[PDB]
Scaffold this active site. Structure first.
Site, short mmCIF file in Angstrom:
data_model
loop_
_atom_site.label_atom_id
_atom_site.label_comp_id
_atom_site.label_asym_id
_atom_site.label_seq_id
_atom_site.Cartn_x
_atom_site.Cartn_y
_atom_site.Cartn_z
N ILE A 13 0.79 -1.22 0.00
CA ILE A 13 0.00 0.00 0.00
C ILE A 13 0.83 1.28 0.00
O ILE A 13 0.30 2.35 -0.27
CB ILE A 13 -1.06 0.03 1.13
CG1 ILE A 13 -0.42 0.13 2.51
CG2 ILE A 13 -1.98 -1.18 1.02
CD1 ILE A 13 -1.44 0.32 3.62
N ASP A 42 6.84 2.89 -8.21
CA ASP A 42 6.00 3.35 -9.33
C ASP A 42 6.87 4.01 -10.38
O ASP A 42 7.54 5.01 -10.11
CB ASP A 42 4.93 4.33 -8.87
CG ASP A 42 4.02 4.74 -10.00
OD1 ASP A 42 3.18 3.91 -10.39
OD2 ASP A 42 4.19 5.86 -10.54
N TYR A 47 8.89 8.82 -17.81
CA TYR A 47 9.68 9.51 -16.78
C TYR A 47 11.17 9.52 -17.13
O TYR A 47 11.96 10.20 -16.47
CB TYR A 47 9.48 8.90 -15.38
CG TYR A 47 8.06 8.91 -14.87
CD1 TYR A 47 7.08 9.72 -15.45
CD2 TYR A 47 7.69 8.11 -13.80
CE1 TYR A 47 5.76 9.71 -14.99
CE2 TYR A 47 6.39 8.09 -13.34
CZ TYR A 47 5.43 8.88 -13.93
OH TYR A 47 4.13 8.84 -13.46
N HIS A 109 -1.29 4.62 -19.18
CA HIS A 109 -0.90 5.80 -18.42
C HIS A 109 -1.98 6.89 -18.43
O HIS A 109 -2.26 7.49 -17.38
CB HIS A 109 0.43 6.32 -18.97
CG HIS A 109 1.21 7.17 -18.02
ND1 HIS A 109 2.58 7.22 -18.05
CD2 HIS A 109 0.81 8.02 -17.04
CE1 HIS A 109 3.00 8.06 -17.12
NE2 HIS A 109 1.95 8.56 -16.50
N1 NAP Z 1 -0.29 8.14 -13.37
C1 NAP Z 1 -0.02 9.45 -13.50
O1 NAP Z 1 -0.49 10.13 -14.41
C2 NAP Z 1 0.82 10.12 -12.45
C3 NAP Z 1 0.80 11.50 -12.32
C4 NAP Z 1 1.52 12.12 -11.30
C5 NAP Z 1 2.26 11.33 -10.43
N2 NAP Z 1 2.30 9.98 -10.60
C6 NAP Z 1 3.13 9.10 -9.67
O2 NAP Z 1 2.95 9.52 -8.32
C7 NAP Z 1 4.21 9.89 -7.74
C8 NAP Z 1 4.00 10.94 -6.63
O3 NAP Z 1 3.45 12.13 -7.19
P1 NAP Z 1 4.31 13.45 -7.49
O4 NAP Z 1 5.70 13.09 -7.89
O5 NAP Z 1 3.52 14.23 -8.49
O6 NAP Z 1 4.30 14.35 -6.16
P2 NAP Z 1 4.25 14.09 -4.57
O7 NAP Z 1 4.71 12.66 -4.18
O8 NAP Z 1 2.92 14.55 -4.12
O9 NAP Z 1 5.31 15.17 -4.07
C9 NAP Z 1 6.69 15.07 -4.42
C10 NAP Z 1 7.37 16.33 -3.89
O10 NAP Z 1 7.29 16.36 -2.46
C11 NAP Z 1 8.60 16.41 -1.87
N3 NAP Z 1 8.59 15.59 -0.68
C12 NAP Z 1 8.54 14.29 -0.57
N4 NAP Z 1 8.53 13.89 0.65
C13 NAP Z 1 8.54 14.98 1.43
C14 NAP Z 1 8.54 15.15 2.82
N5 NAP Z 1 8.51 14.11 3.67
N6 NAP Z 1 8.57 16.43 3.25
C15 NAP Z 1 8.60 17.48 2.40
N7 NAP Z 1 8.61 17.33 1.06
C16 NAP Z 1 8.58 16.08 0.58
C17 NAP Z 1 9.55 15.88 -2.96
O11 NAP Z 1 10.83 16.49 -2.81
P3 NAP Z 1 12.22 15.72 -3.00
O12 NAP Z 1 12.04 14.59 -4.08
O13 NAP Z 1 13.20 16.76 -3.43
O14 NAP Z 1 12.61 15.12 -1.60
C18 NAP Z 1 8.87 16.43 -4.22
O15 NAP Z 1 9.18 17.80 -4.46
C19 NAP Z 1 4.99 10.39 -8.96
O16 NAP Z 1 6.40 10.49 -8.72
C20 NAP Z 1 4.64 9.25 -9.93
O17 NAP Z 1 5.36 8.07 -9.59
C21 NAP Z 1 1.59 9.37 -11.56
O1 3UH Z 2 1.73 11.89 -16.52
C1 3UH Z 2 2.42 11.70 -15.40
O2 3UH Z 2 2.63 10.60 -14.91
C2 3UH Z 2 2.95 12.91 -14.70
O3 3UH Z 2 2.95 14.02 -15.61
C3 3UH Z 2 3.96 14.07 -16.55
C4 3UH Z 2 5.17 13.41 -16.37
C5 3UH Z 2 6.16 13.54 -17.34
C6 3UH Z 2 5.95 14.31 -18.48
C7 3UH Z 2 7.00 14.42 -19.53
C8 3UH Z 2 7.14 15.59 -20.30
C9 3UH Z 2 8.13 15.65 -21.29
C10 3UH Z 2 8.97 14.55 -21.52
C11 3UH Z 2 8.82 13.39 -20.76
C12 3UH Z 2 7.84 13.33 -19.76
C13 3UH Z 2 4.73 14.95 -18.66
C14 3UH Z 2 3.74 14.84 -17.70
C15 3UH Z 2 2.40 15.50 -17.90
O4 3UH Z 2 2.36 16.60 -18.44
N1 3UH Z 2 1.30 14.77 -17.58
C16 3UH Z 2 -0.03 15.33 -17.76
C17 3UH Z 2 -0.79 14.66 -18.92
C18 3UH Z 2 -0.21 13.72 -19.78
C19 3UH Z 2 -0.97 13.15 -20.81
C20 3UH Z 2 -2.31 13.51 -20.98
C21 3UH Z 2 -2.91 14.46 -20.12
N2 3UH Z 2 -4.22 14.84 -20.26
O5 3UH Z 2 -4.94 14.23 -21.02
O6 3UH Z 2 -4.62 15.79 -19.60
C22 3UH Z 2 -2.13 15.01 -19.11
#
Ligand code: NAP
Ligand code: 3UH
Length: 314
Positions: A13, A42, A47, A109
């Site tokens: 989790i 993840d 990325y 994605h």
């Molecule tokens: N499926 C999708 O479309 C999608 C979209 C967005 C995200 N994701 C996944 O979800 C993951 C998490 O989301 P996210 O990267 O957007 O943001 P997040 O986990 O909400 O926040 C990351 C940020 O918070 C900081 N941080 C982490 N732990 C902290 C703590 N204990 N105290 C203070 N600051 C802290 C990190 O800094 P530092 O790294 O500098 O420590 C970074 O700047 C992503 O990395 C990705 O794997 C997926």
């Molecule tokens: O997608 C993730 O996991 C995190 O966001 C990125 C994480 C990474 C990157 C990225 C940018 C340039 C080069 C490689 C990666 C982009 C993005 C980004 O903007 N994502 C938003 C997004 C994506 C696709 C479709 C939609 N939509 O339909 O609204 C929104």
């Protein structure tokens, strides 16, 4: 500490997020994460750091720190690979980079297919994303084949709204239901409707950006900040925990998986130390009350894509 998926496997989790983790830092981050107890990582092809994530995983396997069966590695099919014939190759590239012979979970994605090509975000000359003519049901059938070929143990979706989830669930000849829908979720975007819908169908929800993604490249200085919300800080103080720890524990108590990202060793460790306390039932309702329908992850250039997920209420 793990949740049962509808494929029969258990998913930790708490996982480590890797979006924005720089390629030169993510190997150490993942090594540290595994050392302090993370078993779920993840990842995504888009990325651009899967090779480096893979180096860490392989080193810890070789060092006998953890067995492959104890790890839960997730990646995602990028939008330019929705065409049925491109799905396997995309998965294989991710497997090659991660240095694995299977993924535990492979997600579509985004529901938006983009024109195939080298560019991850093909745009026209006016900045609109260029879609592909792919049917997501065909993409899903291609994902199902990956399970049958042993490349992935589970398949799922990400950023699908409830109608899009429903489309998959109603797919003629559906072979494997999505195991997971990974969506943005935090106290400013609580997602009650979509979560209840997914859980009612036996689909596990993973909460992404649980800290509000303060490092997202399109962040503005005026944007709200979960980590600095005094109301959340107050709940944290009551528990002698950090605000981040509260933000991570919150989705856990909603039966969600959560994937906070960090490349900072101290924070990686801090973020894992969330199994030694409980938010009260009132902490939970109060955090839910902070919903603002504030969404950090979306792209303006995709708002005209016919499969853009965020026009629908949920
Ligand atoms: N499926 C999708 O479309 C999608 C979209 C967005 C995200 N994701 C996944 O979800 C993951 C998490 O989301 P996210 O990267 O957007 O943001 P997040 O986990 O909400 O926040 C990351 C940020 O918070 C900081 N941080 C982490 N732990 C902290 C703590 N204990 N105290 C203070 N600051 C802290 C990190 O800094 P530092 O790294 O500098 O420590 C970074 O700047 C992503 O990395 C990705 O794997 C997926
Ligand atoms: O997608 C993730 O996991 C995190 O966001 C990125 C994480 C990474 C990157 C990225 C940018 C340039 C080069 C490689 C990666 C982009 C993005 C980004 O903007 N994502 C938003 C997004 C994506 C696709 C479709 C939609 N939509 O339909 O609204 C929104």
């Amino acid at each position: 500490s793990r949740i049962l998926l509808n494929n029969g496997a258990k998913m930790p989790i708490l996982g480590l997020g890797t979006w924005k983790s720089p390629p030169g830092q993510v190997t150490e981050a993942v090594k540290v994460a595994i050392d302090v107890g993370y078993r779920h990582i993840d990842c995504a092809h888009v990325y651009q750091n899967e090779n480096e994530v893979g180096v860490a995983i392989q080193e810890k396997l070789r060092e006998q720190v953890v067995k492959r069966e104890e790890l839960f590695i997730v990646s995602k099919l990028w939008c330019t690979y929705h065409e049925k014939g491109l799905v396997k190759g995309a998965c294989q590239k991710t497997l090659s980079d991660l240095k694995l012979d299977y993924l535990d979970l492979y997600l579509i994605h985004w529901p938006t297919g983009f024109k195939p090509g080298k560019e991850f975000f093909p745009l026209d000359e006016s900045g609109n994303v260029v879609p592909s003519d792919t049917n997501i049901l065909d993409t899903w059938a291609a994902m199902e084949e990956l399970v049958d070929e042993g490349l992935v143990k589970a398949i799922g979706i990400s950023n699908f709204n409830h109608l899009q989830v429903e489309m998959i669930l109603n797919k003629p000849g559906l072979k494997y239901k999505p195991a997971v829908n990974q969506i943005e979720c935090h106290p400013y975007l609580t997602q009650e409707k979509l979560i209840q819908y997914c859980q009612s169908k036996g689909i596990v929800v993973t909460a992404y950006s649980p800290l509000g993604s303060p490092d997202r490249p399109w962040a503005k200085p005026e944007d709200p900040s979960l980590l600095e919300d005094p109301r959340i800080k107050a709940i944290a103080a009551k528990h002698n925990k950090t605000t981040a720890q509260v933000l991570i524990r919150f989705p856990m108590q909603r039966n969600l998986v959560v994937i906070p990202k960090s490349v900072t060793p101290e924070r990686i460790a801090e973020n894992f130390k969330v199994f030694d306390f409980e938010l009260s039932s009132q902490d939970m309702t109060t955090l839910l009350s902070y919903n603002r329908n504030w969404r950090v992850c979306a792209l303006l250039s995709c708002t005209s894509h016919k499969d853009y997920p965020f026009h629908e209420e949920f």
